[PDB]
Design a protein around this ligand. Sequence first.
Ligand SMILES: Nc1ncnc2c1ncn2[C@@H]1O[C@H](COP(=O)(O)OP(=O)(O)O)[C@@H](O)[C@H]1O
Ligand SMILES: Nc1ncnc2c1ncn2[C@@H]1O[C@H](COP(=O)(O)OP(=O)(O)O)[C@@H](O)[C@H]1O
Ligand SMILES: [Mg+2]
Ligand SMILES: [Mg+2]
Lengths: 363, 363
Amino acid sequence: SYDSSSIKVLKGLDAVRKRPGMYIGDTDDGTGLHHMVFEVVDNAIDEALAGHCKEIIVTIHADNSVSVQDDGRGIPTGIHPEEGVSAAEVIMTVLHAGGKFDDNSYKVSGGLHGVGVSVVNALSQKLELVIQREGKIHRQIYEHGVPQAPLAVTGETEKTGTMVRFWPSLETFTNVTEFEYEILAKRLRELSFLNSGVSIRLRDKRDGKEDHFHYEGGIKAFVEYLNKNKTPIHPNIFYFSTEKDGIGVEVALQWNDGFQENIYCFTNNIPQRDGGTHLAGFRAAMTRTLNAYMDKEGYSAREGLIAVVSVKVPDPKFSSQTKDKLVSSEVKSAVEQQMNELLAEYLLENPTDAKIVVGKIID
Amino acid sequence: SYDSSSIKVLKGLDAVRKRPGMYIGDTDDGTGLHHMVFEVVDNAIDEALAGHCKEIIVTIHADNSVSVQDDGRGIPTGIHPEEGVSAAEVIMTVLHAGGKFDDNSYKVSGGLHGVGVSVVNALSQKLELVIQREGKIHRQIYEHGVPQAPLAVTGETEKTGTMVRFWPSLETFTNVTEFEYEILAKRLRELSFLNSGVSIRLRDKRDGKEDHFHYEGGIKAFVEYLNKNKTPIHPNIFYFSTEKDGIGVEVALQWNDGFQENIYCFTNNIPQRDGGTHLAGFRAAMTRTLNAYMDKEGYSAREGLIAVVSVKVPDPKFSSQTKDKLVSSEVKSAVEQQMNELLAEYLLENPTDAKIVVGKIID
Ligand SMILES: Nc1ncnc2c1ncn2[C@@H]1O[C@H](COP(=O)(O)OP(=O)(O)O)[C@@H](O)[C@H]1O
Ligand SMILES: Nc1ncnc2c1ncn2[C@@H]1O[C@H](COP(=O)(O)OP(=O)(O)O)[C@@H](O)[C@H]1O
Ligand SMILES: [Mg+2]
Ligand SMILES: [Mg+2]
């Protein structure tokens, strides 16, 4: 009775719906449901990273669908030579298909695996796709990942970008099934801080609530925001942004009078809740530099610390599919070297701050 | 320049080799490399869970390959009706293909996703497959996941089982590339404890070292082993195993005189480093039951605790592909109800133990 007929192949998107834990996570507590939005948003953010998108609009509709509109290049619409259908349709229906498997379309991107928006499509009762590029509006509708018709041109336009609207499948998501404004806002705010000069809008058509995230100060402003209900002890937030040997390293940090340590790490705008090689470089540099300073100034650590570490890595390697831990070993040295040089300079250039912080560490 | 030609589809196993982090984890520190062995071993363990395999032999060969031989049913060898090649070959070359997508072949299994041994095959320079079933020996060789020929019958046998030998690809694994006896032993020992009456052998053909794991006492013996260099404070290890409403719950625990808490949780023999709903049920029951006991005996928690919680769940749901956290909400109540009933009984039946442990908690 255990023979060839016992072996079942899950074709295309059927695997996502069978095993949503592997692709979207927890389908009952709300984190999976909101991750559906964040997969779409992070694809727009990647167009921003590539220097093509300047505005992202996220709308929660009154029917519990969510749309994300960007003004990037537009998902490619042409027939895919190998697959024989539009490239858009390939993207929406095929796992491990995308433009981030080399560095020709995006120098750096949060997307890595070629699955994210295809997972969204798989787990949506319906998904509407509208793409503007090459002077044309292209439209397609999917139901449970199945396209109604081939992607079709329906009008002319002088704009470029991609709009995805999706209605989450209640055959997949249970319990927490309505989108929460504040979960979406928290991440969208973080992304405005991490991406200066992208305008991000959030609109709730249920109650008319709206936000426009377009913070001026970048990850320096992020740190200020993170400290705003705490009591910063010194006024000059440490900040730098560099790019060397293909790796971007942007750091800000400020101490408050508390005793907790909050270090927020990101790789291509994707958070690492479990740290990794960027966090290891940051911690090594902090220690070495504060010690060197104390020694050279003639005295005899991360309590109260708020810090943001955002790296830009062409081909990052993580411990898993979740991207929770960065394992790219060359990033350790990239963070560490930049932050030993620049934090040293900061302590020299801001002696009142330096004295206050060192003060605290002693205690 | 960002158009249909920019979109690349990774077919079959090419995706695993492109993005090994999503499938095998860290390819540089050794944890991925050893996970290759553990994917194969856990498939043999699943045959044991189904009541068909009684011996598993793991061999590290002198050429740095590893083989795993079991005496289970044998990977199915028949032509797969839909795919048109042997079911074995489907298993080895197709992601999301397997016999664990329903409960007909395995009532419970660590395997869930239909990928594990196909990932192994993808990331091996060579893989040799020998299957015995239906009175025949069937053989096939793969190179970087590509079969040399169709699976072929080469002899007769009266035995059943599956042997996989693989040589890991050094185009994938870097740095830690030689198998470590003790990493493999630690997990194989754990699995002997979790699976009484399976014989597990480990042999190193490099130095002649061998072990035979066949512990008598199950997860009670596991706890004894975990406490052996500590100082247990009471002699009777608490133990039960039940099955109710399709969920198996097996718990053992003993206190030592230290202050650390070590609770090891498993679902279908797969460890959850980040806990979940089984751990939550265990903790709730422990609290409630110890408090009820203290109250009824007229007094006025998990320090020093060593415990093993092993659940058997027909269709488990995890937070991710890594299976690090169990999110199946019905398991909380299954653990919790069994352990409130039985731990209460244990405290009544073992009053010297009960007095010693309660003693410690007070302090
Ligand atoms: N908003 C967008 N604008 C332009 N291209 C997009 C957008 N969303 C997705 N794409 C394209 O679709 C491809 C596949 O997306 P997805 O399946 O989410 O996986 P990944 O982002 O990991 O490649 C991307 O790599 C990119 O080429
Ligand atoms: N040692 C074995 N004996 C019998 N069947 C096996 C064995 N190893 C694998 N199989 C079969 O191959 C299928 C696919 O295995 P795999 O790709 O590791 O994924 P999964 O275990 O998640 O299904 C299993 O579901 C099972 O049907
Ligand atoms: Mg993506
Ligand atoms: Mg498996």
